[PDB]
Structure formats: structure tokens, C-alpha cells
């Protein structure tokens, strides 16, 4: 699942069969690391208009 963003430890309690997690706009907002059984939030890096 290629992407770009800032990773942060999530507090969402994923069930043992919950691998990924999508947002309202069909975008991955949470992912489970395959090696370490931890939930990580996917947030795009800081941006904005100039």
C-alpha cells in the first residue's frame, strides 16, 4: 500500500481480523504494521495554500 504521509500510533482498537482502515472519502486513514502488531494512523503531511 504505497503512500505518503506522517505515521502516528493510533488508539483505534482493531479487531484481530481488521487489517486496514478507510476514511469517509475512501482513503486509508489507518494501517496495521505486518511485523509489529500496532495500529498506525495515516495523516498526509502539512500543506496549504500560499
Amino acid at each position: 500500500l504505497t503512500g505518503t504521509g506522517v505515521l502516528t500510533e493510533s488508539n483505534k482498537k482493531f479487531l484481530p481480523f481488521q487489517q486496514f482502515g478507510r476514511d469517509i472519502a475512501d482513503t486509508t486513514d489507518a494501517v496495521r504494521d505486518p511485523q509489529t502488531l500496532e495500529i498506525l494512523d495515516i495523516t498526509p503531511c502539512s500543506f496549504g495554500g500560499v
Partner: protein, 426 residues
């Protein structure tokens, strides 16, 4: 069921019967008008080609679609602030209410700002702001940003307070030039003289008029605090903008004939020669969605601009003056109006003069005393059965028919329906 158009009312018309109200009731009505909507700044490159390099190179081949869309959105964002300024900044000098509330019985403490609360807004303004009410993060992450307005809520509240203070301390002279102080009693007398009612009615029933005004303001507050559908016009625009943003942000979950809706799912499976078709289909679909959204936003902005022009016209004609246009500054004979701030809108409190209790009387178009036809200067001849009098139109105040009340023109054999009656000579 078949909808009823209203109760059937048969008017007792006659060639010698007239109805003149013997009383009146001051009625205060509210009107909600949108003035602006939420600004939108759609990052076209991040929406169509979010975090991609080849997608941007393919999108640059289409032309200046992103440029013209951003230009239209910038024009909308500028014209929204332009409308807000043209509506809420009709004066070039902020006024302030005096510390003494010696108006004559009228209670304006419910529409003037309260220094206790931090936000310099009145009670009605607080109610209106409370009656109008994560998707925001999802919209922001896809390139849909909301720009803040130029004038904050505090500045709009200060403008409304200045308009209200000018209206209650100078009447309508503050709009045509410098503010001229005048007691509120004389201001209401001028208002009554504007609608065709003699000024003595106010100087004789000022207590009743002030009590009715206070009761009307209280009922307006109770109605705004009880129901949740009085500010539906602004909530409608808010919900429409929110639904448009939600549709624009959910259109990204469509394939448009491609193998996947995510660009990373295509750039990680296909090469640089086969994924071109899928990326082109996605770009076409998203660009069509953006064009449709921009067209809808332009039409909605035109509607909001029309509404804001109407609101500014109503402000200038009802608050800064006394408009004689029927059903414009509320239903009835317009006396005065007070503006009120509202989220992305304006709310007026139109004070109107409404007759209450009318009575049947016998009328005559003219009176002949010594072979000369007499016509009322300002009023109409009435008869209570035995005697004849002359009274104003919008109020029952009988007076003796004298030479100073009627003028002579013609003779008796020319007017149809003329009766005989003596004309007093002072």
C-alpha cells in the same frame, strides 16, 4: 385533502358605507435574508493528481482548466466579501448608544450589545447564532479548503450596533448626512406622520405603543428561541454547500472505467505505458466533476448575490429611512426596522402599523351648506347616524366640519352622492 386557499370573507361593500379603524396594534415581523456563503478553494492539482508526478504531467496536457477553475473560485470568494461589505457597511462612522435609556418607554436592551458577555452581540443575535449550526478533515486532506471571511462576526456585530444606535438616536438623518440628535418620541411622531396618521395619536398613546412594542419584541425572542425552523433559509444554504462538498469529495471513490479509484493502486501495479489509459480516464472523470461543481457554485453564488443585493436595498430603504412600498418592509404600514446579525445572513425586525378595530359608518363624498360643495382636505366625511364629522383615514378622530377643514369647489348639482349638512365657521 385539497389545500384550502383561505377563509372566505365577504366584504360588505356599499356606495355609502365606510370602515375606519378606531384602534391599532404595533406588529413586529422578522425576515431572514442570506448575504453570503462559505468560501471554497479547491486545489485542482491535489484533487485530480494528489501526490503523483506522472498524473501531473498528463494533466498539464489538457490546458488551463485548473487555472480557470481556481480563477472562478477566487472570483466567488472575492464577490462574497464584496456583498458582505455592501450589505453591512452602509455607513462610514461607527455610532454608540448613550448610557441613559431615556427613549420614552421603548425597551431596546434586547437588541443592543451586552458588555457583560465577551462577544459584543445582543440576546437576539446570540439566539440566531445558536440556532444555526470528521468530514472537515477529509475535505481538507483532499484539497478542499475553506477560506475565512474578511469581516469577522465581531465586526458585523459592531456594524449592526452602529446602525441600530444611529437609527434610535437620529432616525433617518444619519444616512443622508451627519447624524442629527432627536428624541425617539419625535422620531415616532415623524414615522406616524409618514404613513398618514396624525402625530397626536402617538403623543396620546405613547404608553400603549411602548407596551405593545415591548410585548412584540418579547414574542419575537420567544419565537426565535422556541422553534428550530425560523432560520431555515440560512441552514438551507449551509446544507447545500456541505452536500456539494461531500459529493465532490466522494466522487474520488469512483473508477470511471479504470481498474481502481486510487492512483497509488495503479502506479504500483502497471507500468508507464499501460497505466496511461487508466490515469487519463480518472483525470477526465475528476475534471468533469470539478467543472460541474464549479458551475453549481457559480449559479449558487449568483443567487446569493441577488439575495445580498435585495438585502442591502431593504436595509437602505427600511433602516435608514421609511419606505412607502407596500409589503416591502414587512406587512403593514412600515414605521421603522432594526437590523440584526446572523450567520451568513441578515435579519430585520420590521415595525409595522396595523389597524385593529374598525367600525361601520355612513360616508358622503361632499357636503353642501349654502349652494357650495365642500370637500375634505385630509380625511373623509363620516356620520354616526345623526351628526356628520370629518376624520382622518387610518384612525377614528371625529372633528366638527369647519371652514378650516374643508375647501369649496363647484356646486351641489355636479357631485354624485352629496348630502346636506351645515359647515361651521370659526
Amino acid at each position: 385533502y385539497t389545500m384550502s386557499l383561505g377563509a372566505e370573507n365577504s366584504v360588505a361593500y356599499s356606495n355609502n358605507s365606510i370602515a375606519i379603524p378606531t384602534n391599532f396594534t404595533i406588529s413586529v415581523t422578522t425576515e431572514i435574508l442570506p448575504v453570503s456563503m462559505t468560501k471554497t478553494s479547491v486545489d485542482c492539482t491535489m484533487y485530480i493528481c494528489g501526490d503523483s508526478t506522472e498524473c501531473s504531467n498528463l494533466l498539464l496536457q489538457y490546458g488551463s482548466f485548473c487555472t480557470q477553475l481556481n480563477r472562478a473560485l477566487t472570483g466567488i470568494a472575492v464577490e462574497q466579501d464584496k456583498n458582505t461589505q455592501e450589505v453591512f457597511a452602509q455607513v462610514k462612522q461607527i455610532y454608540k448608544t448613550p448610557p441613559i435609556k431615556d427613549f420614552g418607554g421603548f425597551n431596546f436592551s434586547q437588541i443592543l450589545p451586552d458588555p457583560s458577555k465577551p462577544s459584543k452581540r445582543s440576546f437576539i443575535e446570540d439566539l440566531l447564532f445558536n440556532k444555526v449550526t470528521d468530514l472537515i478533515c477529509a475535505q481538507k486532506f483532499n484539497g478542499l479548503t475553506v477560506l475565512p471571511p474578511l469581516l469577522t462576526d465581531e465586526m458585523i456585530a459592531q456594524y449592526t450596533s452602529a446602525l441600530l444606535a444611529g437609527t434610535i438616536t437620529s432616525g433617518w438623518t444619519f444616512g443622508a448626512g451627519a447624524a442629527l440628535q432627536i428624541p425617539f418620541a419625535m422620531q415616532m411622531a415623524y414615522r406616524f406622520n409618514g404613513i398618514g396618521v396624525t402625530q397626536n395619536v402617538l403623543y396620546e398613546n405613547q404608553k400603549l405603543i411602548a407596551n405593545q412594542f415591548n410585548s412584540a419584541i418579547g414574542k419575537i425572542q420567544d419565537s426565535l428561541s422556541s422553534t428550530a425552523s425560523a432560520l431555515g433559509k440560512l441552514q438551507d444554504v449551509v446544507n447545500q454547500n456541505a452536500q456539494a462538498l461531500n459529493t465532490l469529495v466522494k466522487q474520488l471513490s469512483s473508477n470511471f472505467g479504470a481498474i481502481s479509484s486510487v492512483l497509488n493502486d495503479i502506479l504500483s501495479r502497471l507500468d508507464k505505458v499501460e497505466a496511461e489509459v487508466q490515469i487519463d480516464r480518472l483525470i477526465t472523470g475528476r475534471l468533469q466533476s470539478l467543472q460541474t461543481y464549479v458551475t453549481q457554485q457559480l449559479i449558487r453564488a449568483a443567487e446569493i448575490r441577488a439575495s445580498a443585493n435585495l438585502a442591502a436595498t431593504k436595509m437602505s430603504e427600511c433602516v435608514l429611512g421609511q419606505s412607502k412600498r407596500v409589503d416591502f418592509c414587512g406587512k403593514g404600514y412600515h414605521l421603522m426596522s432594526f437590523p440584526q446579525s446572523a450567520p451568513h445572513g441578515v435579519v430585520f425586525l420590521h415595525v409595522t402599523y396595523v389597524p385593529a378595530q374598525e367600525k361601520n359608518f355612513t360616508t358622503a363624498p361632499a357636503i353642501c351648506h349654502d349652494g357650495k360643495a365642500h370637500f375634505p382636505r385630509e380625511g373623509v366625511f363620516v356620520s354616526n347616524g345623526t351628526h356628520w364629522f370629518v376624520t382622518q383615514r387610518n384612525f377614528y378622530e371625529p372633528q366638527i366640519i369647519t371652514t378650516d377643514n374643508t375647501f369649496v369647489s363647484g356646486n351641489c348639482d355636479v357631485v354624485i352622492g352629496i348630502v346636506n349638512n351645515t359647515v361651521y365657521d370659526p
